Amino acid sequence: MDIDPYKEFGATVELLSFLPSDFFPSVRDLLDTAAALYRDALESPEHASPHHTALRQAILAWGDLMTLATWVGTNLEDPASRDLVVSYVNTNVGLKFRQLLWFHISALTFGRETVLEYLVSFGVWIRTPPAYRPPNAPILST
Amino acid sequence: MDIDPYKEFGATVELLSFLPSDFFPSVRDLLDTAAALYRDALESPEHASPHHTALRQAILAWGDLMTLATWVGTNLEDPASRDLVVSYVNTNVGLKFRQLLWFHISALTFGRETVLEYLVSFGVWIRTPPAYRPPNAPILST
Amino acid sequence: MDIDPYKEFGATVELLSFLPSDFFPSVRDLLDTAAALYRDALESPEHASPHHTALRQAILAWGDLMTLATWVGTNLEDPASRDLVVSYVNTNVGLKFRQLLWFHISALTFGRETVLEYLVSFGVWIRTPPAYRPPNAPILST
Amino acid sequence: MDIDPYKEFGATVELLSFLPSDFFPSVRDLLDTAAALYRDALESPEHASPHHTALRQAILAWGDLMTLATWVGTNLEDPASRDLVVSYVNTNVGLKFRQLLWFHISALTFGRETVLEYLVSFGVWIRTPPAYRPPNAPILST
Amino acid sequence: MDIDPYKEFGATVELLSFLPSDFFPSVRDLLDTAAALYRDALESPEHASPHHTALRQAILAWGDLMTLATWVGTNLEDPASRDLVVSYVNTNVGLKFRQLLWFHISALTFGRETVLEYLVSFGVWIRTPPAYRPPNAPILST
Amino acid sequence: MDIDPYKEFGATVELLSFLPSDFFPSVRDLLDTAAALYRDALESPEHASPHHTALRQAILAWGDLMTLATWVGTNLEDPASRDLVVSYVNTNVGLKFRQLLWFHISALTFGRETVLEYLVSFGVWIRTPPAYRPPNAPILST
Numbered sequence: 001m002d003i004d005p006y007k008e009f010g011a012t013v014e015l016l017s018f019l020p021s022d023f024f025p026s027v028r029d030l031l032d033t034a035a036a037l038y039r040d041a042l043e044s045p046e047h048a049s050p051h052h053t054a055l056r057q058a059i060l061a062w063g064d065l066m067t068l069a070t071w072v073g074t075n076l077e078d079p080a081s082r083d084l085v086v087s088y089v090n091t092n093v094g095l096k097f098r099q100l101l102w103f104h105i106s107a108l109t110f111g112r113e114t115v116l117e118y119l120v121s122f123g124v125w126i127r128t129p130p131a132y133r134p135p136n137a138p139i140l141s142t
Numbered sequence: 143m144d145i146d147p148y149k150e151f152g153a154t155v156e157l158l159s160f161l162p163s164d165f166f167p168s169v170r171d172l173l174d175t176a177a178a179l180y181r182d183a184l185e186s187p188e189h190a191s192p193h194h195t196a197l198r199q200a201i202l203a204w205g206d207l208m209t210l211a212t213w214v215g216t217n218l219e220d221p222a223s224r225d226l227v228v229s230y231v232n233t234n235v236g237l238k239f240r241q242l243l244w245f246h247i248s249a250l251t252f253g254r255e256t257v258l259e260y261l262v263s264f265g266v267w268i269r270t271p272p273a274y275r276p277p278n279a280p281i282l283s284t
Numbered sequence: 285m286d287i288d289p290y291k292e293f294g295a296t297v298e299l300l301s302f303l304p305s306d307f308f309p310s311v312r313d314l315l316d317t318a319a320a321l322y323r324d325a326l327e328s329p330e331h332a333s334p335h336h337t338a339l340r341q342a343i344l345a346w347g348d349l350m351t352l353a354t355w356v357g358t359n360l361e362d363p364a365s366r367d368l369v370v371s372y373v374n375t376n377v378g379l380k381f382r383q384l385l386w387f388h389i390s391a392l393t394f395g396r397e398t399v400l401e402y403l404v405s406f407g408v409w410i411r412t413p414p415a416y417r418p419p420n421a422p423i424l425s426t
Numbered sequence: 427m428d429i430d431p432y433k434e435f436g437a438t439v440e441l442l443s444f445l446p447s448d449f450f451p452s453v454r455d456l457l458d459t460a461a462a463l464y465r466d467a468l469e470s471p472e473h474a475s476p477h478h479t480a481l482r483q484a485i486l487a488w489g490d491l492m493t494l495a496t497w498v499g500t501n502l503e504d505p506a507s508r509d510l511v512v513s514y515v516n517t518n519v520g521l522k523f524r525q526l527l528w529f530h531i532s533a534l535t536f537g538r539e540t541v542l543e544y545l546v547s548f549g550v551w552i553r554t555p556p557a558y559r560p561p562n563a564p565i566l567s568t
Numbered sequence: 569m570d571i572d573p574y575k576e577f578g579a580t581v582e583l584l585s586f587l588p589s590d591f592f593p594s595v596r597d598l599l600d601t602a603a604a605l606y607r608d609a610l611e612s613p614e615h616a617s618p619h620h621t622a623l624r625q626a627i628l629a630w631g632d633l634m635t636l637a638t639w640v641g642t643n644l645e646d647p648a649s650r651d652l653v654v655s656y657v658n659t660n661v662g663l664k665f666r667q668l669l670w671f672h673i674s675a676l677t678f679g680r681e682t683v684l685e686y687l688v689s690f691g692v693w694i695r696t697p698p699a700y701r702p703p704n705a706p707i708l709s710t
Numbered sequence: 711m712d713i714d715p716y717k718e719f720g721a722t723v724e725l726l727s728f729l730p731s732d733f734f735p736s737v738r739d740l741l742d743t744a745a746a747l748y749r750d751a752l753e754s755p756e757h758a759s760p761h762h763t764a765l766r767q768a769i770l771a772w773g774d775l776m777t778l779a780t781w782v783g784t785n786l787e788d789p790a791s792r793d794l795v796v797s798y799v800n801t802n803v804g805l806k807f808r809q810l811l812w813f814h815i816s817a818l819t820f821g822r823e824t825v826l827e828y829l830v831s832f833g834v835w836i837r838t839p840p841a842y843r844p845p846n847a848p849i850l851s852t
């Protein structure tokens with residue numbers, strides 16, 4: 001039934017609510033990072049962590065919708081519909097994969113612990129009111 | 143990069159091409175089967191096998207396209223060309239998910255070796271000349 | 285000298301005569317099956333079994349006749365009598381290759397003993413009087 | 427897919443490009459050599475090297491096309507077509523088997539090493555320009 | 569054949585396309601820089617590390633092109649050192665030598681690990697959102 | 711700035727100029743012989759030897775000038791320019807590459823000592839008067 005990817009990873013789906021929209025880099029940058037620094041283990045036919053499994057499984061989904069967005073700009077003679085659909089692709093759909101792809105890439109580099117710790121210390125950051133807040137946003141580190 | 147769905151789990155996308163599209167059961171069916179069997183592996187925060195860890199994504203990935211069918215269902219003016227898309231969503235873009243679900247369900251329920259041993263077997267049957275050919279079909283045991 | 289194709293691999297050309305020509309799947313089919321299964325044994329420069337080492341030759345041997353069909357396809361004036369030849373190429377001269385491919389594919393995929401154990405079995409079925417005779421057909425397991 | 431016989435033998439198909447057309451003896455001499463000095467292991471139902479496997483598998487192909495050339499001179503009432511076809515049989519088709527049969531026969535007698543070494547030292551021979559070239563062509567030796 | 573110059577160096581041509589073109593200093597700076605630190609090593613008769621080997625061949629490969637464009641300045645008017653020759657050499661082909669020279673000059677200075685790390689450790693810093701990142705890029709330490 | 715391309719290997723430009731001009735085979739032949747002999751080490755992501763490193767960079771250098779030979783074929787319309795310019799890459803500068811390609815290739819297969827001896831021998835052989843020079847040129851040795 002209703003399942004959260006973060007369940008087995010010590011996280012939650014509501015945990016990403018604290019992260020604003022622009023917190024996540026663009027999807028193009030998302031794939032390119034994994035396509036640059038992780039290409040070995042991804043196409044490697046022998047995974048080592050579950051993140052490698054979900055990641056290469058997740059990249060196919062986004063690569064899947066890309067063909068969808070390509071076809072939509074092929075047979076839909078309603079430019080308003082092709083606008084909203086293609087826009088909605090980069091919208092919450094794309095914003096969903098961003099919330100997912102970013103985690104695993106952040107997961108593989110730092111583990112599944114510091115990414116939690118950062119998201120822990122980030123939400124408390126944005127939790128704090130404006131004036132009494134450390135203006136330098138917390139940096140993802142190790 | 144060019145990640146492929148089925149490399150570390152034995153079979154590959156070249157292998158599944160034997161099975162015609164008509165063999166794959168409807169996505170409405172599979173979503174209950176391994177789910178009605180598995181209220182735990184699809185919900186426990188402690189993984190057991192990469193299959194359901196890979197299965198969760200298509201689960202999440204399916205509802206997204208379903209959410210797209212939901213979102214598109216009202217927020218588009220012309221349902222005529224729209225349903226042309228929703229047909230494309232269920233038929234084609236769901237066909238790939240129809241295979242991703244069918245693998246891990248049968249695999250997780252019958253061991254990975256059985257599905258590989260069955261994939262080769264059915265392709266043998268499908269390529270045998272139908273002039274005389276056994277009317278048998280998928281066996282699946284433990 | 286009078287070399288025979290099937291001496292060291294168990295079965296012999298006298299044995300394969302049980303199988304009528306209609307049983308053998310089309311060469312268009314077999315060329316993908318063991319190839320789609322085997323991107324390595326058909327490409328690795330380090331052999332494993334003599335089958336694919338024997339299989340490569342018919343692969344090369346097939347394209348030659350196919351190259352002959354290609355070369356003949358334009359460099360002959362009358363395609364009427366020409367296609368009489370190209371029919372003879374695919375039908376008869378390809379029939380022998382149709383058997384050479386079918387053996388090693390099934391043999392390399394199911395062990396040499398299974399095909400020998402299956403060859404005798406089918407001949408038993410083919411010679412049983414069809415007045416009452418099992419409607420079964422090639423089994424193939426491990 | 428596209429496969430080279432020389433892949434598992436430390437050679438390549440492009441390696442034979444250095445060898446001119448007349449480098450290879452006629453096919454009749456090719457079979458007769460194997461039909462004279464190797465008849466024991468060829469019809470022997472227990473091979474000892476992969477060359478014995480590919481060789482007896484290769485001889486059948488050429489023996490196969492011979493029946494083809496025989497039939498072509500039986501029902502094709504176009505003498506130009508029977509000319510070009512039969513000529514093309516002895517052409518690059520036959521020149522292909524010559525490149526193959528010669529290697530294995532040369533392989534079995536000297537191993538799969540000196541035949542490479544010779545073809546290594548032969549191409550460098552023909553690589554050298556005319557005037558500054560050792561006029562005595564390199565001899566296949568042991 | 570296809571020989572990426574970074575194969576025996578860890579990095580690949582695709583990892584280096586992960587950085588913007590402006591990331592690489594100008595061509596003349598690298599020549600003067602390398603010629604301002606390794607006159608004692610480049611023109612030395614004996615090489616210590618392979619970077620000296622690749623770098624020496626890298627520079628002379630550049631001097632030929634500059635020598636090339638110079639000679640082209642006396643052939644014709646537009647497509648000779650004016651419209652296409654010096655434009656293509658100085659602009660297009662320069663983009664790949666800028667990284668060849670930069671990598672080795674960067675490498676031997678700080679080893680090969682550090683140059684491999686800095687690419688990734690920088691190439692994502694340019695991808696991180698503006699607000700949630702440090703103000704200045706990282707720096708090659710050791 | 712003027713770095714010896716050969717100073718690492720004892721020989722200098724005078725020695726390869728010490729031999730005649732057309733003694734060096736055509737550019738494509740070396741790449742043929744280079745690809746045939748050393749298809750594996752040049753693809754290998756491991757530092758085989760100093761010759762391999764320079765040989766890879768040597769080929770990629772030629773790979774670029776051939777690209778400009780291809781670029782001029784398309785984005786250059788003046789036949790007086792496109793033809794004459796190719797005479798610089800294909801004819802004028804190719805000699806400078808054939809010296810490198812012939813040296814590094816030969817040194818690998820034989821050894822840096824023998825190639826230097828072979829330079830002196832064939833360098834003095836050609837200068838000996840024709841009336842009393844030995845019959846054949848000196849031989850490549852081990």
Ligand SMILES: COC(=O)c1c(CN2CCN(C(=O)CCCNC(=O)c3ccc(C(=O)[O-])c(-c4c5ccc(=[N+](C)C)cc-5oc5cc(N(C)C)ccc45)c3)CC2)nc(-c2ccccn2)nc1-c1ccc(F)cc1Cl
Binds near residue numbers: 023024
């Ligand atoms: C996983 O890797 C990534 O790719 C990655 C990372 C991680 N990267 C790591 C590298 N990185 C660097 O910056 C380099 C390290 C050096 N930096 C430093 O040392 C550094 C950086 C900032 C500060 C900072 O301002 O306070 C300081 C700093 C201090 C640090 C520690 C400290 N004490 C003692 C404890 C005291 C400090 O006192 C200071 C005092 C200052 N005054 C003078 C006022 C000023 C500064 C400081 C140091 C940026 C983050 N994050 C994120 C991300 C994106 C959006 C939102 C949140 N997170 N996304 C990705 C990602 C992106 C795309 C993609 F596809 C995939 C991925 Cl996964």
Ligand SMILES: COC(=O)c1c(CN2CCN(C(=O)CCCNC(=O)c3ccc(C(=O)[O-])c(-c4c5ccc(=[N+](C)C)cc-5oc5cc(N(C)C)ccc45)c3)CC2)nc(-c2ccccn2)nc1-c1ccc(F)cc1Cl
Binds near residue numbers: 449456562566
């Ligand atoms: C595998 O077997 C085969 O069947 C076979 C062979 C091998 N055979 C072996 C037997 N064979 C002989 O000749 C007998 C051996 C005795 N010969 C010698 O001693 C001999 C032969 C030639 C020379 C030669 O001219 O330089 C020399 C010679 C020297 C030798 C070594 C030497 N030092 C110290 C290192 C110094 C030398 O200084 C000389 C100096 C000279 N001055 C006075 C100028 C003159 C000569 C020499 C010696 C010929 C080759 N080759 C080829 C082949 C065909 C085409 C193209 C290339 N290759 N095809 C086949 C095949 C065919 C069909 C078939 F269906 C299947 C097969 Cl496989």
Ligand SMILES: COC(=O)c1c(CN2CCN(C(=O)CCCNC(=O)c3ccc(C(=O)[O-])c(-c4c5ccc(=[N+](C)C)cc-5oc5cc(N(C)C)ccc45)c3)CC2)nc(-c2ccccn2)nc1-c1ccc(F)cc1Cl
Binds near residue numbers: 707
């Ligand atoms: C050989 O490689 C290269 O040439 C190279 C490099 C290497 N880079 C170059 C730049 N570089 C530096 O800048 C030095 C570090 C700067 N350090 C700091 O700023 C720094 C960091 C921390 C502190 C700190 O303790 O608080 C301080 C510091 C102070 C800071 C501010 C200050 N107040 C208030 C005014 C007072 C300070 O008082 C101090 C006092 C101290 N005491 C008393 C002991 C000690 C420290 C400090 C400074 C060295 C490394 N990069 C790049 C490149 C390319 C693209 C993009 C980015 N980069 N390309 C190349 C390349 C180019 C072309 C070519 F052909 C080939 C190559 Cl390879």
